[PDB]
Design a binder for this molecule. Sequence first.
Ligand SMILES: [Fe+3]
Ligand SMILES: [Fe+3]
Ligand SMILES: [Fe+3]
Ligand SMILES: [Fe+3]
Ligand SMILES: [Fe+3]
Ligand SMILES: [Fe+3]
Ligand SMILES: [Fe+3]
Ligand SMILES: [Fe+3]
Ligand SMILES: [Fe+3]
Ligand SMILES: [Fe+3]
Ligand SMILES: [Fe+3]
Ligand SMILES: [Fe+3]
Ligand SMILES: [Fe+3]
Ligand SMILES: [Fe+3]
Ligand SMILES: [Fe+3]
Ligand SMILES: [Fe+3]
Ligand SMILES: [Fe+3]
Ligand SMILES: [Fe+3]
Ligand SMILES: [Fe+3]
Ligand SMILES: [Fe+3]
Ligand SMILES: [Fe+3]
Ligand SMILES: [Fe+3]
Ligand SMILES: [Fe+3]
Lengths: 177, 177, 177, 177, 177, 178, 177, 178, 177, 177, 178
Amino acid sequence: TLLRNFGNVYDNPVLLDRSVTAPVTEGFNVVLASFQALYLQYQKHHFVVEGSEFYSLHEFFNESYNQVQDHIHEIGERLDGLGGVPVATFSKLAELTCFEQESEGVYSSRQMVENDLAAEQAIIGVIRRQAAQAESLGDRGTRYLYEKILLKTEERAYHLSHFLAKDSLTLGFVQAA
Amino acid sequence: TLLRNFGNVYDNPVLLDRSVTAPVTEGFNVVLASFQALYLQYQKHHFVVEGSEFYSLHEFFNESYNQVQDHIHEIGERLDGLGGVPVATFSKLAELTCFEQESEGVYSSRQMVENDLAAEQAIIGVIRRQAAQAESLGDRGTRYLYEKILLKTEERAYHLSHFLAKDSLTLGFVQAA
Amino acid sequence: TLLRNFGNVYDNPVLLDRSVTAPVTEGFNVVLASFQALYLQYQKHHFVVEGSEFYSLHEFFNESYNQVQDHIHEIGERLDGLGGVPVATFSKLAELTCFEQESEGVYSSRQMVENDLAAEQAIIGVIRRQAAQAESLGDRGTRYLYEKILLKTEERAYHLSHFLAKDSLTLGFVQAA
Amino acid sequence: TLLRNFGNVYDNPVLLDRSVTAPVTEGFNVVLASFQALYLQYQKHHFVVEGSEFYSLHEFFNESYNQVQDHIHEIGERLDGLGGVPVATFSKLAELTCFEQESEGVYSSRQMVENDLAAEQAIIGVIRRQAAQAESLGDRGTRYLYEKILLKTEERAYHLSHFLAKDSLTLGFVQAA
Amino acid sequence: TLLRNFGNVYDNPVLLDRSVTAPVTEGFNVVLASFQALYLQYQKHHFVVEGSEFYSLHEFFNESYNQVQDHIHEIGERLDGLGGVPVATFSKLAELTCFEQESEGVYSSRQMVENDLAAEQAIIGVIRRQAAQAESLGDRGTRYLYEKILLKTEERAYHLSHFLAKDSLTLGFVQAA
Amino acid sequence: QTLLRNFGNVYDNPVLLDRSVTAPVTEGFNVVLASFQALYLQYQKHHFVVEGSEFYSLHEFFNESYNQVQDHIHEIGERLDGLGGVPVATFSKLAELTCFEQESEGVYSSRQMVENDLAAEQAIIGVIRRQAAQAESLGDRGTRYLYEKILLKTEERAYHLSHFLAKDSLTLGFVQAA
Amino acid sequence: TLLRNFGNVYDNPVLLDRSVTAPVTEGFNVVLASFQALYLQYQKHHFVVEGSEFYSLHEFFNESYNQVQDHIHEIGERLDGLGGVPVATFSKLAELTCFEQESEGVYSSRQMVENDLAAEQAIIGVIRRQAAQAESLGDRGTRYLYEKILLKTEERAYHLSHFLAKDSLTLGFVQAA
Amino acid sequence: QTLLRNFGNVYDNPVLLDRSVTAPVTEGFNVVLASFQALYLQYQKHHFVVEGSEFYSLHEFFNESYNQVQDHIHEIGERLDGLGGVPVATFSKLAELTCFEQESEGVYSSRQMVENDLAAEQAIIGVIRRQAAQAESLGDRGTRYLYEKILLKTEERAYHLSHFLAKDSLTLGFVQAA
Amino acid sequence: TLLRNFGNVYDNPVLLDRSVTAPVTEGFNVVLASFQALYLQYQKHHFVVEGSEFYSLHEFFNESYNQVQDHIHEIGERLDGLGGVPVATFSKLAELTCFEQESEGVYSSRQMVENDLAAEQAIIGVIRRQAAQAESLGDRGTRYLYEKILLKTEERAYHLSHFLAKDSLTLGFVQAA
Amino acid sequence: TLLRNFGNVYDNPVLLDRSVTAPVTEGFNVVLASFQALYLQYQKHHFVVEGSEFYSLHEFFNESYNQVQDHIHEIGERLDGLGGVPVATFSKLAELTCFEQESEGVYSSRQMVENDLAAEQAIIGVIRRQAAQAESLGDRGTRYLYEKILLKTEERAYHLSHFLAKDSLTLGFVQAA
Amino acid sequence: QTLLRNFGNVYDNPVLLDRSVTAPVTEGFNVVLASFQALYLQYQKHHFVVEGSEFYSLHEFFNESYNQVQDHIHEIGERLDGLGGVPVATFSKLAELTCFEQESEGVYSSRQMVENDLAAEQAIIGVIRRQAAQAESLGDRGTRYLYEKILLKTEERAYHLSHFLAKDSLTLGFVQAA
Ligand SMILES: [Fe+3]
Ligand SMILES: [Fe+3]
Ligand SMILES: [Fe+3]
Ligand SMILES: [Fe+3]
Ligand SMILES: [Fe+3]
Ligand SMILES: [Fe+3]
Ligand SMILES: [Fe+3]
Ligand SMILES: [Fe+3]
Ligand SMILES: [Fe+3]
Ligand SMILES: [Fe+3]
Ligand SMILES: [Fe+3]
Ligand SMILES: [Fe+3]
Ligand SMILES: [Fe+3]
Ligand SMILES: [Fe+3]
Ligand SMILES: [Fe+3]
Ligand SMILES: [Fe+3]
Ligand SMILES: [Fe+3]
Ligand SMILES: [Fe+3]
Ligand SMILES: [Fe+3]
Ligand SMILES: [Fe+3]
Ligand SMILES: [Fe+3]
Ligand SMILES: [Fe+3]
Ligand SMILES: [Fe+3]
């Protein structure tokens, strides 16, 4: 039998008003869903990436989804700790994610990296909003956690950006443009 | 711009006929989807489990979904390697999983363990069928990998089953049902 | 073709008289046999324990028989080193153990813990007598080794005793006996 | 009070018929008893081995019984997991072991190594039979586990065999035959 | 003077008939020679690869010949354990390898990867035949070992083919052929 | 205010080497020290800014390289001081003593960066060989030995830099050659 | 030819306006140059410190420039990630550092520690201003990074001042000034 | 089809060494490389097949030895390529360049195996000394240094092999001497 | 509600008479309180020590209170194991400690080291008394534990003593007395 | 000039009378000198042992002088801590050692092991006398330290005697004396 | 009773070096071995007995130092035996061969201890350089190389000892100078 209903906030032990934990946990579920989406996508990319820079990308994608997994772990624990109910079903994850998952099929290396950067950017957008919200509502712990996650997420965005730059060692001996 | 379509099977570099890799990768995708559902469910259980045995269950659920992650990693890489396209969207995962995920909301610790046991049992059935199939098709690597995963999956079932046994130290001093 | 007969005591290289090594190695063999029985019983308990506290007990029993293995290793080597012949057959182990092993079959988790506590207590009595004897005979190394083992053995008894205490978090919400 | 009787099979959570788990767990108990016997014997040999190649043998015997201990651990857990009751008393272990333990007393290095090889060979015999049985009954997990154990056991047999070979560096300067 | 002649099989301590160990060891020598050839080739590629993706290839080749070295170790020891005589001279290695080594000289990155893939594929064919043989002859340990090695060898093949795929991040800004 | 050692001078050493040995040895160490600081800064810069299709490999390589150069600096700086010399540490003096000129401010292409690093390693290799030979001739075996340890790693970095630059690529199978 | 000109800011992939990244990267370069100067100085002090407390100071200076190196790494990578061009030439480093390096020569232990403290204090002033700026401009990641670095930098300042305190064990038996 | 470097030739190096230096240096490296591959194969074989009363010690020693030889091979092969040479890798060419002949196929006694390994190490020691001296005379300090590192380990293996062969044993207390 | 009252001894599982455990646990509480006092004091000293030998002292004080913490851990567990109730309130700790805590405020390095030595000496006094008591009452485990702790405590006393010795490298160039 | 004269005992900070520390430190110096002699001898044996069992002996001698080095460290530090002056010159070491070092030259493996055993036995005699003395004088820490060292020293003696036993694998195919 | 090697003599070696090389090389190794045993004992003593305001640093340094010296001893003793020599191990012969005299029994000041250790390192440095040069001239590159490895660490210990002795201190800010 059910103890907590999804969408409802329950007691927390850290002296935060339910007026604070409801929107904080609501936003946490959006970020949790989004990161689950991005974890699945990075993992997919790890599985399917091919081509001349395969080895670097394949290693990068693995590091990336490990890092995202750590974000998910911290968010889910805190979300529950604050009395929230974390999303876990495919259908609801799809509803709450803040970006559109890459379609089934295998795309090119460049497209995968572009897809991942766009996803990271959508998440960066949400985290900045939820961090500001937490700060305004007086939830320092949440504000600080988001900023830790933000910094790593911005870093992944920088790294993806560098993969995409129009430079290569091959330009010294291949036809440009 | 796609490079490989989902549901299609492409060339492999390990000298296996398409008549082998088509059903094998089809099966891998079912198992991959099922393990993703189970990973999400174990992780949810890690986040939300409470009560007297919370610490033990919390740890157990964490270890369990980490182990399921390792299965996912091995299956997905091999699936792609055999020329298949691994499933990664929420909608398709929902379609291919061999058990139905626990509904959103928080259930009792006993119900969660029961839900995880039913899930492993569903997966055990699928793995045994896929292993037999790989054997009869001459894909030893796949059969062997399934048996490695099967052994760990049976062990998780053993452990879940032990959590559910109607015995406790507390029976020494509490009223039995 | 034998080199040393069981029940006989031979020369040692540590300048101790046979009047010392005979009872000392006799005692070591009792303790060795008892610890083998306890190792087997702890290991059995690790294999079969189930119920609400299964995970904790499972871990505890594993740690316990690993620790008992270390005692066995130290005793057996020293026993041989002092010119004695260490017991190793099932029949003789049964004869020399200072407590009776739990019968075949699976008992409740409470009964197992109680059985392990009685076993440690039996061994505690024997170790204290053997330590006193070594002291009075002038075998400091043996006395010291027994005290090292005694300290760990008392600690296991403490822990077992704590498992059996009539307290639980569940008393907050279940009917007490 | 007893929950499970020895010799009886109980429920398992891995969808194996009791017609399968009864003979599988019966055979597991034979192998478990045999390995316990061989563990005690290797340990004894570690304790008592003497002579010019003492140091190598003494280290080898220790590695060997550590390895056997790992076999015992896997077998006992799976045996219980399948609903069986693992043997743990001296008397019953003696009844189920598939080889005769070395008699009490200290034998020569060569005899100990011969005794250990004969024991490994008796166990190899049983494991091949139980592996074939498991395969025939549809218990892949058990078949695979046995084959893992078989490989390590065959390896110990090879190593024991090499200790026994009639070659030595000493032959360059000692009287042969 | 000799103790074992090459091309002959002697006694083994694991109770297998020489009707089993003769074809099995003969097969192991073909696989052993093939892996030595592949080890030499991967290591060469590690030494000499240059170009824009040099660093990744360099690492991959290193990991690959390390893994091949591990297969060699297991095969050689078991070959001998089963009573066979393992090949070790340049001349016989050349004779027994199931593929032809790349010629002396430094080839292009792509050619090197193509050569390594062709070698892995030749070896996969032999292993599958040898594993089937071992299964038919009742040598489970050998069948199981081949399967362990097969899985890793197939994985190397996947990785190599991924290197060869006609995709690159550079396609965003260089002229396609 | 008060100085224990003045820059440009050589003080007593505790390892029984004459000033006729330690003066030129420590002078050379200061050139090599300055050069490696310049290279460390350059590799680190390259680590920060490299981008493009092989960014990931180059990123890692540049990081490994400047960590290695850091180890060289540590050994040299300690022995220099040990032999009675005063190691350089100011920006202007480092600029004066370095045996190659640093890449200008700005971000260059991956290829240009690797070329710049290789030319830098080559200048340093030249100095190290000359300084090793001098140490050998002057009887300072410890210094000769240290230089050879560092030389071997420095040559290895040059080899790897050279390999990055080679006109070969997996992409040549499906892109138009120059 | 150039891809990015020093003194200019380019695009970033973390959705920040160049009205934010221009002052933020300009600030990062001042801090980066200051830390390079401090790194060089600590390392110098590590090389040259001598005297009665040499060994402790030697260790401390080593730990300190290692920690400064870590700040440099984070700042440089983020500076670039935000689309700025990080300083690296001796000449521009001299121009941008917020404190003046100690002059060439070996100073007293006390003077060295005083110089390092004055440098840390100059850097603390800049960091606090730059952190405030970043907060005002909406760059949380930068604000947070500066705070991480600030805490360690303040800690180094505490430690340095502790070195300078007019207390010593020697005051029990030497003449105070 | 198309070759970047042809075997037997020396290409440009990035460490400012003349061809008059790198040609003989890399030629010698290829001999030492071939020899160590032969020794690696032999030690590994000995690891696989050694049996008898001291099997356990010899087993371990042979494993340690071929792992060490592997490290030598790795360093040599990389520097050889680095200096512009082409490292040998085919069975027939390895057979041609090795400085000792491999033990014949078959399993020999423990004593014969150790003797064979010692004779092999001794042949390689001879070559390494000559090649080190050449490198020294030609100005290649890095190569000279590397050879000396490897020489020292190789001599240590020879020492241990020699100790295995000594006519002494704990068993002499209770068995009949020859 | 209270289960055990402070000052009262309860059941133990190690077959020691309450006539033994009462004075043993009473003495353990004195030593526990004393070590808590000395832990707080070493920690304080770690926090506040300044001056020319600051770095060494600061590291020494940290090692020292880590070591004391380990003593406290062993004592508290055994104390409870023997059926005693360990002290934990500020007021009662103050009552039972065997030395007077250093007053609030920061003292000189020499004074701190003198204060710590005097504290260690008071504790050494008590441990020797309680060890003799345990020996006389037949509690070997306790006697042995005290002697382990004694040895480390004597060692800290030696080290403190050395800090205080009237020798210094500075005497070669500073005015003595 | 001197701070402590050899042969005299000074103050200690662990509240022991000099009637205790004088005989105890005098004893520690005899044991210290004996262990230095033994350390030198084991190390020599490590350098020079050759023959068929060379490799095992080589390892054993290394382990042994490492362990002796550990005894030396503990004894030296406590000797000084108790206010004594530890021996360190070749001449006085020769004078104080309780056994005579093996002569210069390389002896047989068996002779070396016999010499090492005789040395261990001489040291065992001293330690037992010194431990008894320390117990009688009320120096528990010293008594306990000697017992720790005694146990390891006895263990080395067992191992050495095992090397000397007239048994060997070679007795199966070589002529017994 | 029966000896396999007699002290003072050189036996066959398995690394193809003539007795004209191994006799003086192993003779020198025995002097350096004896000297390091003496230094090991001294550093260890200093570890045990050092006290005073800088006791903690000196304590650690002396421990690190004698562990390092132990490593030197291990390498030397093994190569000495390997080359066919007989390593010294008795107190009286160690006393005869050591190249410096041990500090007398008793506890000296921190400063005197550091001075004694430095003088000891300097004596050993002198011997090592002479023995390295001899090995070089005799064609024993492995021995020359080993000495240089050890020399470099030994010189580093001398540098650190020298730094302990320098007339500088944080205390000079508030205590009366000499
Ligand atoms: Fe967690
Ligand atoms: Fe948690
Ligand atoms: Fe992967
Ligand atoms: Fe043991
Ligand atoms: Fe387990
Ligand atoms: Fe388990
Ligand atoms: Fe490399
Ligand atoms: Fe092996
Ligand atoms: Fe992969
Ligand atoms: Fe990075
Ligand atoms: Fe340093
Ligand atoms: Fe240093
Ligand atoms: Fe980085
Ligand atoms: Fe601190
Ligand atoms: Fe092996
Ligand atoms: Fe490499
Ligand atoms: Fe605890
Ligand atoms: Fe506990
Ligand atoms: Fe060795
Ligand atoms: Fe110490
Ligand atoms: Fe042992
Ligand atoms: Fe200490
Ligand atoms: Fe050694």
